[PDB]
């Protein structure tokens, strides 16, 4: 029940805490070569207790690189997301991001992967969807996951199809693996 | 199998978790009569993910207790504890920048009240998975005094390989429970 | 002596920074003739604030090179390098949760091609400040092979308190440059 133990951990954190912990997280993210040399980064739109991603998309758009959000039938496809002066509105769950652009995996250079629970070896507890569990076996680029330390555990229920994320960045440090 | 699990477990912990848990761990150890009364202590210089033993040494000298660390023989499985004179360079030592130097007149097992025993894995029965070379396996068999082990809950297991002529540690101190297997 | 400074300067370095610096040191090392041409390499298992050696052992093996680590004796300045076979638990060893299993297969000096010499304080002349044992100051005196020592700039000093006795290493190598000693 790692899903339960985390919901509690994340729930205990105050808006100030999360906002203060994620700052140092983005710091690490952006300080990686994988972020600097990335011309196209893939990412989801944060929600609830999911790590906030707005500062990521905004940063990317500020450095000219292109960003594509997911649009997930256990099949998931990524499509470019042109800069809009209403990203805030979108994160407020008051607008949809709006195609012929079926952006192939090979064209994206960095994959920011979402998750609920993580392992020290890159394994994760999905949201129940099952998309990021299969899209990774189709992907072969650089993958990373931003998460709080209260989301990181010793071991996570593995599956004969589970593919680990390459890097794990937290508010305290950063971790490598496969 | 177990050694590896304890690696992932100890790695998964944040620096805050560790700092926290080990803090209550030390309080427990310092609240015990065997420690309160111990006038000379045996302990090792921790490293890596091993439970940090710096505060155990500092607290000792702070209470005017003797402190002796282990001097292992890479020769055989023979080990011997030597008195360790209070050192202002303890910090420098626990950082790998200084090897702790009265190497004369060895400290006999009898002259050692308490003895913090380090280990990688432990079962609730006081049995443990050493670092290898089983230096303690034979030392403990010739030691009669009190023996307590500091460790985190993720180092504890239902059971570990116990091959005859293995002696369990009398006390286990973790982040939660305080096992006293006799 | 002034190794206190090295302690402060080292422990002050951005944790994430040491990783980046050690990298450049590694690249400098691996593209070296004295390295690519060495069959057997002497190195040590690093710890604490010392320079991380894992990448060096891991790389030595990946290029099918022999690797030997020390197993120096106590109360004496006797150090003898012994072969260390590819260890899939290498990470467990660096975590301090498993002593490196090596058994005794002595490797004489003339059998060592390249030797990574550990140190806390260095000077541009290849002179170093050991950890205290004085094993290297005694081993290097009778080693006629190549010697290289990796280190962060905050370890290198314009000059290190020497004494009329043991020799300095042949080549220094930091995160900024490589220094050949006369």
Closest-CA residue to B15 (of C18, C15, C45): C15
The dihedrals phi and psi of C126, each to the nearest 5 degrees, come to 80, 0
Q: SS3 for C67-115, per residue?
A: EEECCCCCCCCCCCCEECCCCCCHHHHHCCCCCCCCCCCECCHHHCCEE
Q: Are A112 and A52 in contact (CB under 8 A)?
A: no
Q: Are B52 and C101 in contact (CB under 8 A)?
A: no
B64 labelled as ligand-binding? no
Beta bridge partners, C121, equal C129
Q: Are C105 and C68 in contact (CB under 8 A)?
A: no
Full strand arrangement of the beta sheet holding B121-123: B128-129, B121-123, B156-157
Q: Are A65 and A39 in contact (CB under 8 A)?
A: yes
C39 labelled as ligand-binding? no
Residue A69 to residue B29: CA distance in whole angstroms: 53
In angstroms, the separation between the Cα of residue B37 and the nearest Cα of chain C is 31
Chains that touch A (3 or more CB pairs under 8 A): B, C
Q: Are A31 and A103 in contact (CB under 8 A)?
A: no
Residue A123: alpha-carbon gap to chain centroid = 14
Angle (CA) C109 C115 C120, round 5°: 120
DSSP characters over A6-52: HHHHHHHS-HHHHHHHHHHHHHHHHTSHHHHT-SEEE-PPP-TTSPP
Experimentally, the structure was elucidated by X-ray
In angstroms, the separation between the Cα of residue C60 and the nearest Cα of chain B is 22
Q: Does C131 touch chain B (CB under 8 A)?
A: yes
Q: Does C14 touch chain A (CB under 8 A)?
A: no
Encoded tokens for A100: 């012929």
Residue A86 to residue B17: CA distance in whole angstroms: 40
Encoded tokens for A65: 């690189």
Closest-CA residue to A42 (of A142, A163, A164, A128): A142
Paired sense of beta strands A124-125 and B171-173, if any = unpaired
Residue A154 to residue A77: CA distance in whole angstroms: 31
For tokens 């090897």, name the residue.
Answer: B99
Query: What are the C-alpha distances in Å from B59 to residues A142, B114, B172?
Result: 47, 14, 19
Closest-CA residue to C56 (of C71, C68, C73, C74): C68
Cβ neighbours of residue B159 closer than 8 Å, sequence gap 6 or more:
B123, B125, B127
Residue C69 to residue C102: CA distance in whole angstroms: 9
Q: Do B46 and C133 touch (CB under 8 A)?
A: no
In chain B, residues with a C-beta closer than 8 Å to the C-beta of C48 are 47, 94-97
Q: Does C77 touch chain B (CB under 8 A)?
A: no
* Helix H or strand E encompassing B92: helix B90-93
Residue A45 to residue A70: CA distance in whole angstroms: 9
How many Cα neighbours within 13 Å face the side chain of C102? Answer: 23
Nearest to B14 among A121, A149, A155 (CB): A149
Q: Does C50 touch chain B (CB under 8 A)?
A: yes
* Helix H or strand E encompassing C122: strand C121-123
Paired sense of beta strands A142-146 and A110-112, if any = parallel
Q: Do A155 and B14 touch (CB under 8 A)?
A: no
Q: In units of Å, what resolution does this entry have? A: 2.5
For tokens 């990524």, name the residue.
Answer: A78
Asked whether the CA dihedral C139, C141, C142, C148 is positive or negative, the reply is: positive
Which residue is closest to A173 within chain C, CA to CA? C16
Q: Does C97 touch chain A (CB under 8 A)?
A: no
Nearest to C99 among B4, B73, B133 (CB): B133
Q: Does C87 touch chain B (CB under 8 A)?
A: no
Residue B159: alpha-carbon gap to chain centroid = 20
Task: Quote helix, strand, coil % in chain C, to nearest 5.
Answer: 30, 15, 50
Q: Does C110 touch chain A (CB under 8 A)?
A: no
Encoded tokens for A72: 């997930």
Nearest to B97 among C49, C94, C133 (CB): C49
Encoded tokens for B43: 């302990």
Please name the fold of domain A1-178. Rossmann fold (3.40.50)
Class of residue A168 by CB neighbours under 10 A (exposed 0-12, middle 13-18, buried 19+): buried
DSSP characters over B17-55: HHHHHHHHHHHHHHTSHHHHS-SEEE-----TTSPP-HH
CA trace torsion B114, B115, B121, B125 (10° rounding): -40
Which residue is closest to A174 within chain C, CA to CA? C16
Chain A residues 28-47 with a CB less than 8 Å from chain C: 28, 31
Q: Does A149 touch chain B (CB under 8 A)?
A: yes
DSSP characters over B116-154: B---SEEETTS-EE-SSTTHHHHHHHH--S--EEE--GG
Angle (CA) A167 A173 A176, round 5°: 25
| SS3 state at C178 | strand
Encoded tokens for A172: 């305290």
Full strand arrangement of the beta sheet holding B66-72: B79-83, B66-72, B40-42, B114-115
Nearest to B74 among C47, C71, C132 (CB): C71
C131 labelled as ligand-binding? yes
Q: Do A120 and B8 touch (CB under 8 A)?
A: yes
Residue B150 to residue B118: CA distance in whole angstroms: 7
Closest-CA residue to C120 (of C81, C84, C151): C151
Paired sense of beta strands C121-123 and C128-129, if any = antiparallel
Residue A141 to residue C107: CA distance in whole angstroms: 44
Paired sense of beta strands C128-129 and B40-42, if any = unpaired
Encoded tokens for B25: 């761990």
CA trace torsion C19, C137, C77, C149 (10° rounding): 20
Residue C21 to residue C27: CA distance in whole angstroms: 10
In chain C, residues with a C-beta closer than 8 Å to the C-beta of B74 are 71-73
User: What CATH number was assigned to the domain covering residues B1-182?
Assistant: 3.40.50.10420
Q: Does B99 touch chain A (CB under 8 A)?
A: no
Domain ranges within chain A, ordered by starting residue: 1-178
């Amino acid at each position: 029940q790692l899903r339960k133990k985390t919901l509690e951990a994340l729930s205990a954190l105050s808006n100030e805490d999360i906002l203060q912990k994620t700052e140092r997280m983005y710091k690490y993210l952006f300080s990686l070569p994988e972020w600097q040399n990335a011309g196209t980064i893939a990412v989801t739109i944060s929600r609830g207790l999911e790590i906030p991603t707005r500062p990521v998309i905004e940063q990317a758009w500020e450095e000219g690189k292109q960003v594509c959000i997911p649009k997930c039938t256990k099949k998931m496809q990524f499509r470019t997301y042109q800069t809009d002066d209403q990203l805030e509105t979108v994160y407020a769950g008051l607008l949809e991001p709006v195609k012929t652009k079926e952006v192939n995996p090979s064209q994206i250079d960095l994959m920011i992967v979402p998750g609920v629970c993580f392992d020290v070896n890159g394994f994760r507890v999905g949201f129940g969807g099952g998309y990021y569990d299969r899209y990774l076996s189709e992907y072969e680029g650089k993958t990373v996951s931003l998460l709080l330390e209260c989301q990181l555990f010793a071991h996570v229920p593995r599956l004969p199809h589970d593919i680990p994320v390459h890097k794990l960045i937290t508010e305290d440090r950063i971790i490598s693996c496969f």
